[PDB]
Amino acid sequence: GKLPPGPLPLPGLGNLLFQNTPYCFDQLRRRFGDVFSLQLAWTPVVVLNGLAAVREALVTHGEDTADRPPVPITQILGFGPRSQGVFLARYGPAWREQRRFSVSTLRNLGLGKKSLEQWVTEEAACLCAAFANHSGRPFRPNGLLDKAVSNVIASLTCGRRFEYDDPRFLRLLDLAQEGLKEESGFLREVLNAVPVLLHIPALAGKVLRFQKAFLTQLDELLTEHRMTWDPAQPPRDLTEAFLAEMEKAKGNPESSFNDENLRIVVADLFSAGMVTTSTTLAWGLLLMILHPDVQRRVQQEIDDVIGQVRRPEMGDQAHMPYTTAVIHEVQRFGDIVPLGVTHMTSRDIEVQGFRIPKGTTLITNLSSVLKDEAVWEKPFRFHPEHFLDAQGHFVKPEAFLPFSAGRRACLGEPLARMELFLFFTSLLQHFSFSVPTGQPRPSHHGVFAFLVSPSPYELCAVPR
Ligand code: HEM
Ligand SMILES: C=C[C@H]1CN2CC[C@H]1C[C@H]2[C@H](O)c1ccnc2ccc(OC)cc12
Ligand SMILES: [Zn+2]
Ligand SMILES: [Zn+2]
Ligand SMILES: [Zn+2]
């Protein structure tokens, strides 16, 4: 077929002609259409916009678009054929085994005595207390949200939480957010393109110094956890399930259950689960002080269904359509992963009539789905009625894809939903939130850095 249209590529730079990327892509779509081509660096890229283009690539041709672009520098992090974690794992057996293991482990920990929900519920109480200690004073909520959300992954993975002032916990979070910044920069581009340049210790010890330090701190926690593990008892957490799997797999060089993969898998869940759920909650509180009327309506629904004393539970969610709408609207408007995570074609395919060669990097423009003017009533406004009908029933349109779609769609979504509902409703249950007086109305526009964070703001949290 015909290759997707796009801007004429320069001789050597191509289409290279960061902080404003999601805006630039919205301009190219209106200019060239829902499926267009770019030559970013030395990589051939196809951008997909709208639900139809994204679905066709990820669902209809799901088998041919489930791969990731190779990332040579991950060799520095201990990556190998049977140890690719989940997130950046090439499509194949090493990815599928670990994908099925996390999906299933999350499922099992979410059933029975409901340990995940219990961990989340306790973490919310801790988060509430930490908020109450700021009573009367404006503060940035971001740090505390990070800690609460990081402890939930800590609970999932190592069966413990950490105190909010614990030294190692703090360094761990610090290294994780520094490591995120290392995802951006020209360096990793050149290094992934010309991997032989990695033999220069100057460049190799710089490209992933924070992620490598992040992993070092994790090992120390895994080493401790390995001492306390009781293999005579059912696995309490994901690391123990993994460890048990690793024992059975001793002698099998085909297994992806090994020590090198364990640290990558745990780091993946932290990386994937921290900044997303936290940033989203940070969007949520911002939108609640920018729109206090919505806040009050949520608080009314909370009193009528839950009360001012009892802790929110997940069974409440089905009886709180307005709060559910709002939380979905926080995700849709917040749009925290506008360009998602890159896929690669493992086979020539057809999308919207155009030919996509094998080995093409696909960018799924999720933002273009969440903000589609054809689908949403007022996509650039915060509008909880995007998820309500006239009767007040919660409705989830198909264009709600903040977790992407197909085989690689967020494996964390059920946990994320749980965290968003329990943290959000718990906070609004006990506190009224507002902009501090004599401070400027905070911007509803985010800052892009792969992830989109709300603009820095402070709030007041007043007990109810
Ligand atoms: C508000 C919360 C979250 C959002 C918006 C979000 C969003 C995303 C997106 C866009 C992807 C890429 C899908 C693709 O490649 O097409 C992804 C993948 C992933 N997420 Fe999430 N995520 C969230 C929370 C979490 C949590 C809590 C966990 C873990 C407990 C998690 C674990 C993962 C993993 C492991 C992947 C890689 C899946 C794979 O490649 O097979 N995420 N997420
Ligand atoms: C891309 C895969 C790996 C590289 N980074 C650390 C481990 C893995 C996760 C990712 C980063 O934490 C991260 C978290 C959540 N959403 C992301 C979305 C995009 C991204 O880079 C474009 C990095 C993201
Ligand atoms: Zn344990
Ligand atoms: Zn209805
Ligand atoms: Zn209270």
Swiss-Prot record:
The UniProt-reported impact of residue 216 to P is: In allele CYP2D6*93; >90% decrease of monooxygenase activity towards dextromethorphan and bufuralol
CDD domains listed in its UniProt record: CYP2D
Q: In which pathway does it act?
A: Cofactor metabolism; retinol metabolism; Lipid metabolism; fatty acid metabolism; Steroid metabolism; cholesterol metabolism
Mutating residue 310 to G has which effect? In allele CYP2D6*25
This protein's gene is called CYP2D6
Report the protein name in the record: Cytochrome P450 2D6
**MF-aspect GO terms:** anandamide 11,12 epoxidase activity; anandamide 14,15 epoxidase activity; anandamide 8,9 epoxidase activity; heme binding; iron ion binding; monooxygenase activity; oxidoreductase activity; oxidoreductase activity, acting on paired donors, with incorporation or reduction of molecular oxygen, reduced flavin or flavoprotein as one donor, and incorporation of one atom of oxygen
Q: What are the names of the required cofactors? A: heme
Indicate how the chain sits in the lipid bilayer: Peripheral membrane protein
- What's the source species for this entry? Homo sapiens (Human)
